[PDB]
Amino acid sequence: FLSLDSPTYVLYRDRAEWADIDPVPQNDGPSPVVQIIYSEKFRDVYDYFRAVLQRDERSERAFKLTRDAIELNAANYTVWHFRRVLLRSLQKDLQEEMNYIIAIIEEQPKNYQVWHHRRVLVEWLKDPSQELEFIADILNQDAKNYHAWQHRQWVIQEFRLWDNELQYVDQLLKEDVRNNSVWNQRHFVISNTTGYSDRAVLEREVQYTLEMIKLVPHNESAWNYLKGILQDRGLSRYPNLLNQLLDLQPSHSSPYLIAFLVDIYEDMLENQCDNKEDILNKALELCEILAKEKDTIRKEYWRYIGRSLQSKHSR
C-alpha cells in the first residue's frame, strides 16, 4: 500500500504497526570491508527485514515489507526466498503475485531473481497462458534480452507450446535479420519440432538462409545459421554448395564467404576426395587472404588453420 517513492513515505522505525519489534542492524563487525554507506530508507527497510527474518515472522506486514526490500535491491535472493515462503504460508493469491512480477520484470528485465520468481509462479499455478505474450512485450523492448529468451524456451518446452513460435521467429527476423537471439530461436523450434534431418525442411531452411545472405551478405548470423545446420552432416555431403558460393563472390564477397569455402575444403580433405594436395592449396591460399588481408583481427586463428591443414594433409 505505502510506496517507496510516495511523498508520505515513512521509515519503518516511525510506524505504529512496527512498534513491537526491534530492528536488527547488520553485523559488519568491528572494522569492516566493502562497507556500503546505505541510505536511511534502505538501511531502515533492511534492519526490519532482518528482524522479521530472524523471528521468522510469517505475516502480512512481513510480506509487504519484502516488497520494499525487493524494490530497494531486486538482486537480494534471500529476500525473494522469504517472499516465497510467505506466499505459501499466508496462502496468497498467486494471480495477483503474477501481476506484481509482471510489473517488476517490466522495470528490471536484466535480473535473474525476477525471472526465476515468475518461473516458480507458473510452476505452482501450472499455467502458461500469459507467458508468450508477456515475454513478447519485454522482447518488444529488448529483442535480445537473454532471460526473456531463456524464459520463453523454458515455457515452450514445458507446455509444448511450439505451434506458433516459428512464425514469431519470422516476424522478428523480418524486423531485424541480424538478431542472433532470433536465429538461435529458429534453431531451437525446428530442432525440436520437425528436426533438420528432414530434406524438405533442410532445403527450405538453407534456401531461406541464402536468401538472407543475399539481401545482407555481411550479417554473420545468417552465415552461422547456414554453417550450423549443414555441418553436423558434413559440408562435403552437399557438392552444389561449394560451387554456388563460388558464384556470388564478385557481386557479394565477404570474409564469411571465404571462411565458409575454407570449411568446405576442410571437409573435402577429411573425406579422401578428388585432389588431396589440390584442394589443400585453395584452402591454404585463402588462409593467407584472411590472415593477411581480409580478416586480420583473426590472423592468429587463420595461421593455426593453414598450419593444421598442412600438418595432416601432407604426404
Binding site: S31, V34, I36, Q153, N180, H218, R298
Partner: protein, 403 residues
C-alpha cells in the same frame, strides 16, 4: 609502425551495413562512431601516441573501495564477496600487496558471510549462494594466508554443494534457486581448490555442460540458449577443472570465440551481432588459453608457442585506449561508468593478452610503455597462478571429507 587501431588500413574494418539497416547495425555503427573518435583523438590533437596504464589512479580507486562504498552500491549489497574478489584481484594484478591489516578484516568479514550450512552468502546472514561462495573462496585464496584458508569450513562446503546437486548432473545456484552453467563452474572452482571433490559430486555434470554447447559453437546458459561469453567461459573452465574438455566440440568452440573479437574495435562482444565490452576481455579472450591447453593435451601439433589465438595487440589497444577511466578504474566502453567488476575483468583480460605460458614457452607482448605489464592470471580461476598452487598444495594435505 606502431598501433594497429590507428593504422590507415584499419578504417576499412568499419561496418558494412550492406545498405540494409536494423537496430543491430544502427547500434553497432554508433559504437564504431565513438570508438573512431577515441582512436582519431591522437592524430586530430597534434601529438604522437604512447599508451599508459593509469596504475596509481586504479590503485587509489581500489584501495578505497575495498574499505567503503557510496550508496550507488546498494544493488550490490547481496554481492559483497564479489566486491572483495573483484577488488583484491585487481590489486594483485597491479601488483599491490595486501596489508595484514586488510587481509585479516577481509578474512573476518567473509567469515561473517559464511553460512552455518556451508557456502557463503552475499552479506552477513544472507543465505548461501554459489556465486558469492566462489567469490569468497577466490578472495580467501588471493589472500593465501593460513588465516584465510582456515576460514573455509570444508565439511559444510561439501554438504552445501551436494544439497544443490541435481539428478541431471547440473546444480542449483542456491537452495530453491535455479540452474545455469555458472553453478557448475563455481561448484568446480570451489570444490577443486579446497580439495573436496568426491567421486560422485560431478557425475553427469560434464554431460550437462556438453549439452549447453549449441549450433553456434559456443555455450549457452542452459541447453537451447544462445551462445554467450560468460556462460562459455564457465563451461569450458568447469570442464578443464573436471578434466573433460573432450566432451565439447572444441573446434567449433574455437571458431566461435575467435569470431567474437570485433574487427574494428579490437575488443570482444559477449555474443554475435551484439556490442563490444571490456569485461569480455576476460570471459571470451580467457577461453583461448583454456583451449590452448586442451588441444595440447591431444598433441595438436599446429599450435603457436608465442601467441594465443586472438589479436593480442588489438585487445590491449582496446583496453588501454577505450576502457580506462582518467579518474581511476575501468569500463565496458567509452561513455559508461567505472566499476569494480570491469576494473577486475578488463585487467584480467589485459594480463591474458600480455602473457603466453605453455609448458616451456613463455612469450610476452606489452603494448605502450613497459610499466603496463600486469602480474599473470590463472585462466581457470582468475586468481594468480601462484595462489592457485599455494592453495591446492595446502588443501591437498587434508583429506577429501570422507575420506
Amino acid at each position: 609502425e606502431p598501433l594497429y587501431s590507428l593504422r590507415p588500413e584499419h578504417a576499412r574494418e568499419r561496418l558494412q551495413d550492406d545498405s540494409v539497416e536494423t537496430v543491430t547495425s544502427i547500434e553497432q555503427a554508433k559504437v564504431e562512431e565513438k570508438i573512431q573518435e577515441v582512436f582519431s583523438s591522437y592524430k586530430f590533437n597534434h601529438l604522437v601516441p604512447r599508451l599508459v596504464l593509469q596504475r596509481e589512479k586504479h590503485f587509489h580507486y581500489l584501495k578505497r573501495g575495498l574499505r567503503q562504498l557510496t550508496d550507488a552500491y546498494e544493488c550490490l549489497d547481496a554481492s559483497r564477496p564479489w566486491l572483495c574478489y573483484w577488488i583484491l584481484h585487481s590489486l594483485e594484478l597491479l601488483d599491490e600487496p595486501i596489508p595484514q591489516i586488510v587481509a585479516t578484516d577481509v578474512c573476518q568479514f567473509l567469515e561473517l558471510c559464511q553460512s552455518p550450512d556451508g557456502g557463503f552468502g552475499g552479506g552477513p546472514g544472507q543465505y548461501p549462494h554459489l556465486a558469492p561462495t566462489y567469490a569468497a573462496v577466490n578472495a580467501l585464496c588471493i589472500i593465501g594466508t593460513e588465516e584465510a584458508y582456515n576460514v573455509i569450513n570444508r565439511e559444510k562446503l561439501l554438504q552445501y554443494l551436494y544439497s544443490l546437486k541435481q539428478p541431471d548432473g547440473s546444480f542449483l545456484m542456491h537452495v530453491g534457486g535455479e540452474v545455469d552453467v555458472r553453478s557448475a563452474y563455481c561448484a568446480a572452482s570451489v570444490a577443486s581448490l579446497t580439495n573436496i571433490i568426491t567421486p560422485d559430486l560431478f557425475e553427469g555434470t560434464a554431460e550437462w555442460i556438453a549439452r549447453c554447447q549449441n549450433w553456434e559453437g559456443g555455450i549457452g546458459g542452459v541447453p537451447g540458449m544462445e551462445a554467450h561469453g560468460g556462460y562459455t567461459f564457465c563451461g569450458l573452465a568447469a570442464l578443464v577443472i573436471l578434466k573433460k574438455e573432450r566432451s565439447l566440440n572444441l573446434k567449433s568452440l574455437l571458431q566461435w570465440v575467435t569470431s567474437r573479437q570485433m574487427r574494428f574495435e579490437g575488443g570482444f562482444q559477449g555474443r554475435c551481432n551484439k556490442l563490444v565490452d571490456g569485461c569480455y576481455s576476460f570471459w571470451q579472450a580467457g577461453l583461448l588459453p583454456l583451449l590452448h591447453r586442451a588441444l595440447h593435451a591431444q598433441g595438436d601439433p599446429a599450435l603457436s608457442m608465442s601467441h594465443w589465438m586472438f589479436h593480442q595487440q588489438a585487445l590491449q589497444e582496446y583496453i588501454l585506449m577505450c576502457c580506462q577511466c582518467p579518474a581511476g578504474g575501468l569500463l565496458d566502453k567509452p561513455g559508461k561508468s567505472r566499476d569494480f567488476y570491469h576494473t577486475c575483468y578488463c585487467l584480467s583480460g589485459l594480463s591474458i593478452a600480455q602473457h603466453f605460458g605453455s609448458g616451456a614457452m613463455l612469450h610476452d607482448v606489452v603494448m605502450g610503455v613497459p610499466e603496463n605489464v600486469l602480474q599473470p592470471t590463472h585462466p581457470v580461476y582468475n586468481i594468480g597462478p601462484d595462489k592457485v598452487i599455494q592453495a591446492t598444495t595446502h588443501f591437498l594435505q587434508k583429506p577429501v571429507p570422507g575420506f
